[PDB]
């Protein structure tokens, strides 16, 4: 509800990101000038006065906008717009420090009798580096650049900041000594070349700055030329502190770069595995065409990566289902296996599905194997080859796009009729046996419908009649299950169940294990309406069972005169 | 931290030993010491045994610290043979110790950081979207949920599948269980029903503005709003969506899709970060089937005798109808086995709760069909079950006469026994 | 508490209950199984099923720990085929135990 | 010099021998062994049991640098099943192989 709470801008809102970059640049300057202003100056010269004023104006504007922009409530993870909470957020955290930084501390120091303790308040302005920290957070999160790479860029920025501040503090410690004792300061007693760096407070600012920063940069890499060394006790102590901190920071930098190198990239792992492989091939004097084949294997192995779906299981199963139905399902509708089948069942296949790319020539399943995976061949060709007792591994066929194999070992669970090899890399949509079996139990009508699909391919070269027959025994099994269900539910009287199931399948009279159609037992109940349906279903009314029980005889036995009349009709 | 303390202590001791080696020389040969011949700036440490204690200490420690970082300014340096030998020892030891420091820090940052873990995952996810040519509409969502995974870290727990399923069951019974008892729709059942359906629950989180179950879409995962706020907008034909109620804590949706078997009649969008509990529709329906005895009262708290959405049972009720059906069905499948001849399957159904004395819609018990079909082993296991060999069907056919009429004289002998 | 095998599971490993107790709570249609125990060290489960080629008779869970010496079902079957008479001895010995070992009885 | 197969062992792993000769010492129950050398380069051992389901005829100990091509029982038998007439031909060829070899068992 942004309408109620006006004059509030989004953190991602445009024309504020540009202002964020502008204030980032201004913060970089202020954070890298404040050490210079504090150390090399005991009061800004009149030439550099407008710069300080404009800086404090800019950070005042920064405070003003920090009282307006919205933010994402980390606990709730929604962008809250209420100005009261924005004000509370800023006032409680990150407001006071920045506001204190906005004070014209140099002006206060000059209009305070020139007391140094007021100028020590200039170090508060360094807290404007928080903006650099924020930008580095945003840059790190951004996947475009490596996380550890930014970690070294942030470390480099820390190195530069700390070195520059160390130089400024070192020159400041030089200035703390009275000028009469300037001969006891690291800069006062410096005679690089012929320049005796005497009366150091009267040199160009840039000469003093570079000299101090030179010392700092040299110690940053611990070169220790020794030309610029500490002389006072305060300078010695500061050098101890800076040198220890710089030891730790430089070790951290070396570690970050080392982690970059150690972790490596995908191509590096490929190349090391290839080093292992060329070792193998060179020792075994393998055929060069075969060597090319192995190189192609591993080359295609890293070139085609799909384990992100393993990493996609983190995303909730609803969204995984959405991705599945948006990628695999177009392929699945085309496959004749599920042609004319309930699309919800096919969708459940799509969710239970597994994208895979087996290598060219890599057998999917050996001959006569109980396959635990039903593979959908999509967008490409795969080889199917039947091997028999004579050993003839004749190629059944190239199955081709939008086809399926392995269902023989799932629908009826028979050993794999054809070893299924590959001719070239193609899409395989793996289905675990248990998943397909379970969804078949859920939808026995879709089970019989897969059966009817095999029947639509029955005449065609779907399976060798012998293998197909093992399947039609299982087909008769499921039709018999539906037969007993028809009998039981006709005995029950649920008309919708019979009607939907019958139009689904089992239109003829189904003899149960006693050879009995539902007509007799429905007649026993006096179910004249089911008797009426079954009249419309052409169920034979002279159908004596295995034990010779006529529907007319059974109805006469039951005494349901209306059903007897219908049967006689 | 240990090695940094070692650095501090070794440098302090090295500074003390260095100044001591300065003192071992006679006070006349002080000019041949590191501190005696020290002329830093305009100050000469001439009477180096008479200077202020802290000046001497900070000078020695200046030397020790800079050498520890191998700065080697050269302003302070060993002069004597004692000083030079000690600096050799100190420098050789400090090189190894600094190498250990770098190694320890590098090991720490080679271990990995949760930000790095997320980056790796997200980078590969974006590469998957590129290679798969996915749509942006859901790319935003998938990146959002990866970030959410980081924002909760609930994924260590799924990385803890290694802990045995009993302990995982107990952590589920510690967090899901109080919830699932709190919600009244799922309250009032056997401890089993609750516990198992807890075991299958999976934690998920969703960002504001995400339709998890849209109106008219079959729900395959029954979600529970443990913490957070959801919105159950009824999307009308024109497209306008009116939220009947807001789905907060203790609110279940998608149960209609599993029980009434109706695709969700109201789009459920996300208002805020919600701690949802996925429950597979197949699994929920299965647990009702196993627990139809409790399913009676549970549907009496969701669908039956329930005015929360003013529906008792639009679909056919089965908590008691399919129970009565099932008592006969299970024995019917037993009879199907007796016609088939699968001893183990037959036994497994008897284990399931099948009464082998139950008949069929024609009065024929599994004994009857087993004897007629002549699976003597089937009849023998049924004999161990002691089924009535005298109960007949609706057509005046006793089991002995089944075997007689079917010509099963061996089964006749078994029945006579 | 590391349930090894439950009733109905296809048996592929004969596990010898060595040092450490072993629950082997038999399954019951109550849905809460039962409380029968299979003792501890110097015991065995998965044997019987493998011999009779049936699936796991009941649920078996670890009481506190069990140094199970895994035996592959095909390998054990090869032994019983090759030691036919000795294989019979096992079943005979089992019935001998079964009369007091109601767990298997 | 490494004992690999011992007598009376149900071997699920036959071996094809490539380099160096062996010793098919049929361990004599008296205490010594037959000392029969097992032919090495381009020969084999540990297979007769797999061939005809007898116990391991002799104790074989690697005598020279041996590189072998150990073959599993399970898959070898499965391949026999797939290539039946070929498998029977291998059975016959094994008989012919040891007809002139005059092997003890």
Curated annotation (Swiss-Prot), chain B:
Free-text domain note: The segment S4 is probably the voltage-sensor and is characterized by a series of positively charged amino acids. The pore-forming region H5 is enclosed by the transmembrane segments S5 and S6 in the Shaker-type (1P/6TM) and contains the GYGD signature motif which seems to be involved in potassium selectivity.
Name of protein: Potassium channel GORK
Predominant location: membrane
Record localization: Membrane
Disulphide bond pairs: none
Family the entry assigns: Belongs to the potassium channel family. Plant (TC 1.A.1.4) subfamily.
Gene: GORK
Function: Major selective outward-rectifying potassium channel of the guard cell membrane. Involved in regulation of stomatal movements according to the water status. Assuming opened or closed conformations in response to the voltage difference across the membrane, the channel is activated by depolarization. Conductance of the channel is modulated in a potassium-dependent fashion. May interact with the cytoskeleton or with regulatory proteins.
């Amino acid at each position: 509800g942004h309408n109620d709470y006006k004059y509030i801008i989004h953190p991602k809102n445009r024309w504020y990101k540009a202002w964020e970059m502008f204030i980032l640049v201004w913060a970089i300057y202020s954070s890298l000038f404040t050490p210079m202003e504090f150390g090399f100056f005991r009061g800004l010269p009149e030439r550099l006065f407008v710069l300080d004023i404009v800086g404090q104006i800019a950070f005042l504007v920064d405070i003003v906008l920090q009282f307006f922009v919205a933010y994402r409530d980390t606990q709730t993870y929604r962008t809250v717009y209420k100005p009261t909470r924005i004000a509370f957020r800023y006032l409680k955290s990150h407001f006071l420090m920045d506001f204190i930084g906005c004070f014209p501390w140099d002006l206060i120091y000059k209009a305070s009798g020139k007391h140094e303790l007021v100028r020590y308040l200039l170090w508060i302005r360094l807290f404007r580096v928080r903006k650099v920290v924020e930008f580095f957070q945003r840059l790190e999160k951004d996947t475009r650049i490596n996380y550890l790479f930014t970690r070294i860029l942030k470390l480099l920025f820390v190195e530069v900041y700390c070195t520059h501040t160390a130089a400024c503090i070192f020159y400041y410690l030089a200035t703390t000594l009275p000028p009469e004792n300037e001969g006891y300061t690291w800069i006062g007693s410096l005679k690089l070349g012929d320049y005796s760096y005497e009366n150091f407070r009267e040199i160009d600012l840039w000469k003093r700055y570079t000299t101090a920063l030179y010392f700092a940069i040299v110690t940053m890499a611990t070169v220790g030329y020794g030309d610029i060394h500490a002389v006072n006790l305060r300078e010695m102590i500061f050098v101890m502190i800076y040198v220890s901190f710089d030891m730790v920071l430089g070790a951290y930098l070396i570690g970050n770069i080392t982690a970059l190198i150690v972790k490596g990239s995908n191509t590096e792992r490929f190349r090391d595995k290839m080093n292992d492989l060329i070792s193998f091939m060179n020792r075994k004097k393998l055929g060069r065409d075969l060597r090319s084949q192995i190189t192609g294997h591993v080359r295609l192995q890293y070139d085609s990566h799909y384990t992100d779906t393993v990493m996609l299981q983190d995303i909730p199963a609803s969204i995984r289902a959405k991705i599945a139905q948006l990628l695999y399902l177009p392929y699945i509708k085309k496959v004749p296996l599920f042609k004319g089948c309930s699309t919800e069942f096919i969708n459940q296949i799509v969710i239970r599905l597994h994208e895979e790319y087996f290598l060219p020539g890599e057998v999917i399943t050996e001959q006569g194997n109980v396959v635990d995976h039903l593979y959908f061949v999509c967008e490409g060709l795969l080889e199917a080859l039947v091997t028999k007792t004579d050993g003839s591994e004749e190629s059944v066929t190239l199955l081709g796009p939008h086809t399926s194999f392995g269902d023989i070992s799932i629908i009826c669970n028979i050993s794999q009729p054809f070893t299924v090899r590959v001719c070239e890399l193609c899409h395989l949509l793996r289905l675990d046996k248990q998943s397909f079996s379970n969804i078949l139990e859920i939808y026995f009508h879709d089970g019989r419908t897969i059966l009817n699909n095999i029947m639509e391919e029955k005449e065609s070269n779907d399976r060798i009649k012998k293998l197909e027959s093992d399947i039609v025994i299982h087909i008769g099994k499921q039709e018999a299950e539906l037969a007993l269900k028809v009998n039981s539910a006709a005995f029950q009287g649920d008309f919708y169940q019979l009607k939907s199931l019958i139009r689904s399948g089992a239109d003829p009279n189904k003899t149960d294990y006693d050879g009995r159609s539902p007509l007799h037992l429905a007649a026993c109940r006096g179910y004249e309406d089911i008797t009426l349906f079954l009249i419309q279903e052409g169920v034979d009314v002279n159908l004596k069972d295995k034990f010779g029980h006529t529907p007319l005889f059974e109805a006469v036995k039951a005494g349901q005169e209306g059903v007897i009349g219908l049967l006689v009709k």
